[PDB]
Amino acid sequence: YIVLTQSPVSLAVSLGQRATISCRASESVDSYGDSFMHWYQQKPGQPPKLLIYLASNLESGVPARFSGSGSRTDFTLTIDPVEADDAATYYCQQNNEDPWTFGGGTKLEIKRADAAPTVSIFPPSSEQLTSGGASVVCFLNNFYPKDINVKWKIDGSERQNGVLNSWTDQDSKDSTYSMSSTLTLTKDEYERHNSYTCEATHKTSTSPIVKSFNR
Amino acid sequence: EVQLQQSGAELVKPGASVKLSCTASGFNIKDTYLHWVKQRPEHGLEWIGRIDPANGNAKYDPKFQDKATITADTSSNTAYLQLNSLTSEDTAVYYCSNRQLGLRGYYYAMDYWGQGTSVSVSSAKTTPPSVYPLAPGSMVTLGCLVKGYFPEPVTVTWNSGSLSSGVHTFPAVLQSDLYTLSSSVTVPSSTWPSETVTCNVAHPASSTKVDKKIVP
Amino acid sequence: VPKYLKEPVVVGYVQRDSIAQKIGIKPGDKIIKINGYEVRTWEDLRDALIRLSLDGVKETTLFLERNGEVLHLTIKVPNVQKGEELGIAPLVKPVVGGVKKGSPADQVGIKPGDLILEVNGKKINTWYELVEEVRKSQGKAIKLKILRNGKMIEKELIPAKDPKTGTYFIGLFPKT
């Protein structure tokens, strides 16, 4: 079968600039003056979407800033200029020969200007306290770059026990990330304390952004 | 307009089988082929096979030739994917698709995908999610916690879909054989709490469809 | 890449029920501008159309040449998010440039240089129409009237479903 090796595996490109992704095929994929090689874009949680087909042809509506070149065994997808919407994983695909194969994928990160998080803290719901649990939730929204730190404090003293973090994928419009931080503890010990602090440390600032509530 | 509409998420136990469906609109499958593609969590795309609905001739990747069985029904414009003898490598999102192409001199592309069907292969029983609201204690941020479910996935929407903007739904996390995620909505603080803000949660495997409105 | 992309926008084909047909664009029309975007090539047209849609323009003026006059028509800007297009194409005469060996067309003796006049008693003027009729054949035999050196010849052939193209194929490639 035709092996498709895709390069690079990952890259970070600044808004406005050029992205180059290559696909190598183990055997030729040409027939009667066409290359049976195509490029897909896959956004998080979405099905693949065709961009280029038969090496070089734009799918309807796909902007000219996308182009495909190559023949035979060596193919390139160019994205120039790159925009916020291009945050995604890209795949080459060949169908010259059965079975149809995909390349391994290339994950494109969009480099944008640094942006500090918007922090929000939320107390446990009555609905949760009634059922016996106590989750304190902190949203760090719309920041760049992805790297961020969160510290919890219960009455001024630090806690990392029972903290879980989850990052979104890069936003297709503003190129930012977001992060939820969830502190889970028993209803029991939650009601034994008053001050609940969430503080975010991000490249944008030496001093942390702090959000609190008193129970 | 062309659509490929796939059946809902499936929780299945190891060793068994599942049958997924794909229903096509705006074209006759009989005039073309339907394809099935596999995508495991954190993995890329793998072609499973195609079928010609006109003659039932299905072709596979030799690696799937015996674990996947592809059938089609022209009268109901529908293709099926049957996975048998399920292992944990079979846990994935499954996509049906159609492509049609014009060649040199008359280039065109028709390319359509279903939304995908999630298949979880597990011994574990189904547990429904708990759905808790998040409220503060010119822009207001509100949330919705979805706690302790199995398996994935779950769908969260705000005001039945009237809010797709300013919405962050975070990837689930696995804590002791249960899943937890949350979602945040940011609206103009004139709309809240003047008007309704409600998170809609659906969990296929436990057949749950709870709504939870956010109150001060 | 196809060479028409860098050529002037002379309409050869108008898709049926397309924005183009609705407003009365005809083969022979030379598209020269749309909104404030000069159209010298098919590529310019494509790029302008995508730009307008993405900038949220709903309606704009299309400038044509017809019998040496400029015509101004208001068009809906095609929705690129739905893949919607204007519905015009450059002329590709139904002249055979190549015949794949072994193909249904090869088997019935179709040769490079043939002019396909008619498919199933339906006159065609363009390669797009031939393609359309093959796509709609349902894998049943189709009749072709062919012109070879001024002589009228009748041919009948059965389209094969081709896994590469996802559709019926008879084995013909147009002349460029």
Both C23 and C62 in one domain: the answer is yes
Contact: C163, B33; criterion CB under 8 Å: yes
Amino acid at B36: W
Both C21 and C62 in one domain: the answer is yes
Q: Best residue in B27, B35, B101, B103 to probe C by mutation, most C CBs within 10 Å?
A: B103
Going by DSSP bridges, is the β-strand pair B10-12/B117-121 parallel, antiparallel, or unpaired? parallel
Where do the structural domains in chain B lie, given as residue ranges?
Answer: 1-123, 124-216
Both C41 and C103 in one domain: the answer is no
E strands, B8-138, in order? 10-12, 18-25, 34-39, 45-52, 57-60, 68-73, 78-83, 92-102, 108-113, 117-121, 130-134
Paired residues of A109 in beta bridges? A12
Both C79 and C96 in one domain: the answer is no
Q: How far apart are alpha carbons C9 and C30 in whole angstroms?
A: 6
Domains B1-123 and B124-216 share a fold: yes
Q: What is the largest CA-CA distance in chain B?
A: 65
Cβ–Cβ under 8 Å, residues B90 and B121: yes
Residue of A nearest to C80 (CA): A61
Q: Which domains does chain A have, with CATH numbers?
A: 1-112 (2.60.40.10), 113-215 (2.60.40.10)
Q: Is 2.60.40.10 the CATH number for B1-123?
A: yes
Q: Output the domain CATH number for residue C143.
A: 2.30.42.10
Q: How far is CA B138 from the centre of its chain?
A: 35
Buried b (16+ CB within 10 A) or exposed e, A188-206: eebeeeeebbbbbbbebee
Method: X-ray
Q: How far apart are alpha carbons A137 and C27 in whole angstroms?
A: 63
The alpha carbon dihedral of A62, A67, A72, A75 has a sign of negative
CB-based contacts of B140: which residues, under 8 Å, 6+ apart?
B186, B187, B188, B189, B192
- Touching subunits of B (3+ CB pairs, under 8 Å) are A, C
Both C64 and C132 in one domain: the answer is no
By the 10 Å C-beta count (0-12 exposed, 13-18 middle, 19+ buried), C172 is classed as buried
Q: Best residue in A37, A39, A119, A137 to probe B by mutation, most B CBs within 10 Å?
A: A137
Cβ–Cβ under 8 Å, residues A115 and A143: yes
Contact: A54, B99; criterion CB under 8 Å: no
Q: How far apart are alpha carbons C129 and C14 in whole angstroms?
A: 11
Both C30 and C6 in one domain: the answer is yes
Both C102 and C75 in one domain: the answer is no
> Which of C92, C161, C166 is facing B105, going by the closest CB pair?
C92
Both C57 and C22 in one domain: the answer is yes
Q: Best residue in C46, C47, C164 to probe A by mutation, most A CBs within 10 Å?
A: C164
Both C118 and C168 in one domain: the answer is yes
Q: Among C61, C91, C121, give the residue marking a domain's end.
A: C91
Both C14 and C61 in one domain: the answer is yes
* Residue closest to A91 by CA, chosen among A31, A5, A150: A5
Q: How far apart are alpha carbons A136 and A131 in whole angstroms?
A: 15
Domain limits at C110? 92-176
Tokens 């292969």 identify what position? Answer: B121
CATH topology of domain B124-216: Immunoglobulin-like (2.60.40)
Both C110 and C65 in one domain: the answer is no
Cβ–Cβ under 8 Å, residues A121 and A135: no
Cα-flanking dihedrals φ and ψ of residue B208, to 5°? Answer: -115, 140
Going by DSSP bridges, is the β-strand pair B130-134/B117-121 parallel, antiparallel, or unpaired? unpaired
Q: Among C38, C66, C91, give the residue marking a domain's end.
A: C91
Return the DSSP state at B150: B
Contact: A50, B44; criterion CB under 8 Å: no
Cβ–Cβ under 8 Å, residues B94 and C159: no
CB-based contacts of B156: which residues, under 8 Å, 6+ apart?
B144, B146, B169, B181, B183, B199, B200, B201
Which residues in chain B have their CB less than 8 angstroms from residue A120's CB?
136, 141, 143, 184
How many distinct structural domains can be found in chain C?
2
